[PDB]
Design a protein around this nucleic acid. Structure first.
Ligand SMILES: [K+]
Ligand SMILES: [K+]
Lengths: 79, 96, 153, 192, 260
RNA sequence: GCCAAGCUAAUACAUGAACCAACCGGGUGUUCUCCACGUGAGACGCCCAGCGAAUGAAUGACAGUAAAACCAAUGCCUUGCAGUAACACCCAGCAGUGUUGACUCAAUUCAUUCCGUGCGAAAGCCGGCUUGUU
């Protein structure tokens, strides 16, 4: 029943003295949990940054258009 | 500093001019103007009250909508001079 | 109410399949005015590069051509050659002759040589035997056709 | 096997090409689909580059689009009525590109009522159930749009003519559009 | 595909003798064309002479010592072409690859913080997914958000450390350009006028500082400064001037005599 | 060259990650608050709105004219038109602007669709220090 140490129960075999214990696969230690959680973090952060470059670039396009529009409105103001 | 206050989100079809006078009631209003963006310009007689008005109306709810009020740099005297400047050049245009 | 659909064209529809351009829809009650000619019809007519003028019969014509460089997806690239119309006995296709002189180095003299090319000719041009045409290289249009007519002189 | 090279063809001069090379896999050909009307049966084909081609064997449904309304619906294929290649393709009910088919007109009738409030026949959509705000939207759309009688009569009957715009033996699906305008009037004469 | 590259079929700029090797390092795909690149084994062994053999060349490269554009490379067949900053921190070489007046590759040594300054020529302008303007350069890099005024044929100076563009130089007449193709390649000159023939190649007429009028196809020029006087980065030692061969012969004979 | 039975793994095969986590539009509701008595406005419920692929519709530019009335609607000043980007808000310029010599191309929005013939953060491995449910 879960929430226990699994390394105390697996089968060891003696040869003729050393005991042969298999490597425990799919054992997600907290070190393994660290990178998996880190994996889902940089992904959402890296798409958050991409929206900033899109946002700032749209500022570059619109700020120039705003400048040109009032420039045409200042020239017609004198007219 | 400036007496003018910018008020939103007052919608013209949703709220009548009398009801938008109701939250302005209690503080003297020089003039009220209504706009499509659902933002309204209401000139205030007392510049001191305008500084009090934003504090009084900060976080308030009007007609079921959370209301945002800010003081506006535009003044009545600069517009009325522009207004008179409009009529004189208007009359010239009609003569053309 | 009910829209007055455009009548069928007897002089163009003779191929037992409906002839239409695969770039525009001509069955709209309201067009887009982007692809519309001066007669009120919906027509696709691009412009090819290298400073070639789209003929008026291509802009305001009734013909349908899937291999015409102006009113289809056939693009001109590669080589732009020049020749004389040799034969117009096929349908939408002409044979041109590229007459040239070949220099024989040993004898220090030239000799007259000619080359034949099968070229697709759009209904916008209608050339005649002995005329002069400018052709542009396109994709293989048939077993022998790799050029499209661009001018008629 | 099947090849698409020009080595077997005669030269334009009429001469015979002397082939000095064995057949190549880069010039192969495959056997055609001969897609027919029926329950959906397809066969994947491992094309060049690892991509898969869906050789459809039988098909019964596909997305058919009303071009004048920018609308498309999934409908079942009822019949194939015209083929510009031969009558044998109509007689065998072979689905190929540009072949004229008859599809179920029910979704286009349901959409037209939901959009314009004009039930052509007048689960099923009811125009009068719509809230009174919606009729204002319908009136704005009704002045913008005017439908053709030839198409509308097809909705009333329940079957509407269409033209397949996809390649069933290449993509594995039979999509199309409804015949509108002079194209429809062209095919009505042949079918009559 | 083919994996071998014969000694004779190898580019002549690599300077490998036809008697020593039967084969040559075939440049694996990457940033530069195999006709326009020095494999990092060729660079580390035949040019810098840090490696004695090719076996001692893989020793250096696999260790990650050789950095290209602020990035370590381990494959000896890495292209490592033109206008790239190569750094070996153990020896602090910090040099970039350029073309001398004779058209060959040059290890132009760079100063500190000059490695960050790097240029690259825009070869294609297209939109990626989501309406994103993208510019791909001669190095193969893709710029996700370039300057709104950037066009094809202009070069952007690009910070390798920051991974960000810092300025743009538009391709116009009266700019400093360095030729990258042919026998004319490796010459810094000034664009006097460019003749535009649609479809075919574009002809770029240039005039270097000494006043020589030379031309080439517009696909070979590379803008290197706003004017001939001031250049963004350092260039090979000849300053991009090809002097007369007869005077080339006379001076080296005089200099050889001056030794004795 | 070969079968049958017992285990046992993987980055072999399959399945699958809700919250943390946005902007964005289309179809709607016999839904609630209002204005005069409908191009009316606002909230909320549900149906879709990922990359790619299939079909259809719109974009993917103009560049051979100068002034007034008239009517309906909508902006404004004040209670008739001078000024003026576009927009009925939470974004008062978060695109009116891809490219080529030329594109039925790139890319975007809208409608239907993907049935093995697609898509995980391999649900993976290893290292360092301060040895850390970031
Ligand atoms: K064909
Ligand atoms: K080309």
């Amino acid at each position: 029943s879960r929430t226990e140490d699994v390394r105390k129960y697996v089968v060891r075999r003696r040869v003729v003295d050393r005991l042969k214990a298999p490597k425990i696969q799919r054992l997600i230690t907290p070190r393994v949990k660290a990178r998996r959680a880190k994996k889902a973090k940089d992904a959402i952060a890296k798409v958050r940054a991409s929206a900033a470059e899109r946002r700032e670039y749209l500022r570059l396009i619109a700020s120039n258009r705003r400048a040109l529009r009032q420039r045409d409105h200042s020239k017609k103001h004198t007219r | 500093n400036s007496s003018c206050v910018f008020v939103s989100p007052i919608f013209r079809p949703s709220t009548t001019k009398a009801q938008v006078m109701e939250l302005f009631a209690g503080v003297k209003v020089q003039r009220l103007r209504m706009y499509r963006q659902n933002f309204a310009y209401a000139y205030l007689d007392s510049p001191a009250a305008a500084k009090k008005f934003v504090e009084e109306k900060n976080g308030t709810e009007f007609r079921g909508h959370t209301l945002r009020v800010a003081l506006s740099a535009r003044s009545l005297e600069k517009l009325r001079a522009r207004q008179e400047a409009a009529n004189v050049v208007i009359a010239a245009h009609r003569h053309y | 109410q009910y829209y007055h659909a455009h009548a069928v064209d007897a002089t163009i529809q003779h191929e037992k399949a409906y002839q239409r351009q695969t770039a525009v829809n001509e069955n709209m009650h309201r067009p887009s005015r982007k692809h519309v000619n001066k007669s009120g019809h919906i027509r696709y007519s691009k412009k090819i590069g290298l400073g070639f003028k789209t003929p008026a019969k291509a802009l305001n014509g009734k013909y349908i051509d899937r291999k015409c460089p102006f009113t289809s997806n056939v693009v001109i690239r590669g080589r732009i050659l020049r020749g004389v119309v040799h034969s117009t006995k096929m349908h939408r296709t002409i044979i041109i002759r590229r007459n040239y002189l070949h220099f024989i180095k040993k004898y220090q003299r030239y000799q007259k040589r000619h080359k034949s090319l099968a070229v697709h000719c759009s209904p916008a041009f209608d050339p005649k035997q002995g005329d002069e045409v400018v052709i542009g290289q396109c994709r293989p249009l048939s077993k022998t056709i790799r050029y499209n007519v661009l001018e008629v002189v | 096997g099947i090849v698409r090279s020009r080595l077997h063809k005669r030269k334009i001069t009429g001469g015979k090409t002397k082939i000095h090379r064995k057949r190549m896999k880069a010039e192969l050909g495959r056997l055609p689909a001969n897609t027919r009307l029926g329950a959906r049966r397809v066969s994947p084909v491992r094309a060049r580059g690892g991509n898969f081609k869906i050789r459809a064997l039988r098909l019964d449904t596909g997305n058919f689009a009303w071009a004048s309304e920018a609308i498309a619906h999934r409908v079942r294929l009822l019949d194939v009525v015209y083929n510009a290649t031969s009558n044998e393709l109509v007689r065998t009910k072979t689905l190929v590109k540009n072949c004229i088919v008859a599809v179920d007109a029910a979704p286009f009738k349901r959409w037209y009522a939901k959009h314009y409030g004009i039930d052509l026949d007048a689960d099923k959509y009811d125009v009068n159930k719509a809230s009174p705000k919606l009729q204002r939207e319908w009136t704005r759309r009704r002045r913008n749009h005017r439908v053709e009688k030839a198409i509308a009569d097809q909705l009333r009957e329940g079957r509407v003519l269409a033209r397949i715009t996809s390649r069933p033996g290449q993509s594995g699906r039979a999509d199309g559009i409804l015949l509108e305008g002079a194209e429809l009037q062209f095919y009505l004469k042949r079918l009559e | 595909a083919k994996k071998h590259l014969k000694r004779l079929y190898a580019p002549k700029d690599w300077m490998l003798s036809k008697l020593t090797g039967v084969f040559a390092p075939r440049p694996r795909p990457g940033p530069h064309k195999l006709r326009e690149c020095l494999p990092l084994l060729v660079i580390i062994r035949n040019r810098l002479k840090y490696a004695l053999n090719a076996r001692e060349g893989e020793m250096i490269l696999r260790q990650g010592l050789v950095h290209v554009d602020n990035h370590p490379r381990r494959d000896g067949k890495y292209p490592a072409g033109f206008m790239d900053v190569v750094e070996i921190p153990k020896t602090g070489d910090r040099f970039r690859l350029m073309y001398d007046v004779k058209g060959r590759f040059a290890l132009v040594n760079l100063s500190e913080a000059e490695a960050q300054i790097k240029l690259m020529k825009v070869v294609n302008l297209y939109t990626a997914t989501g309406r994103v303007p993208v510019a791909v350069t001669h190095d193969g890099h893709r710029i996700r958000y370039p300057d709104p005024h950037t066009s094809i044929g202009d070069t952007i100076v690009y910070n390798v450390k920051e991974k960000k563009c810092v300025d743009l130089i538009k391709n116009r007449q009266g700019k400093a350009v360095i030729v990258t193709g042919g026998a004319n390649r490796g010459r810094i000159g000034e664009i006097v006028k460019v003749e535009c023939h649609p479809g075919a190649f574009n002809i770029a007429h240039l005039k270097d500082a000494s006043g020589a009028e030379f031309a080439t196809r517009a696909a070979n020029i590379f803008v290197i400064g706003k004017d001939l006087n001031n250049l963004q980065v350092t260039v090979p030692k000849q300053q991009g001037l090809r002097m007369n061969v007869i005077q080339e012969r006379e001076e080296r004979l005089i200099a050889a005599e001056a030794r004795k």
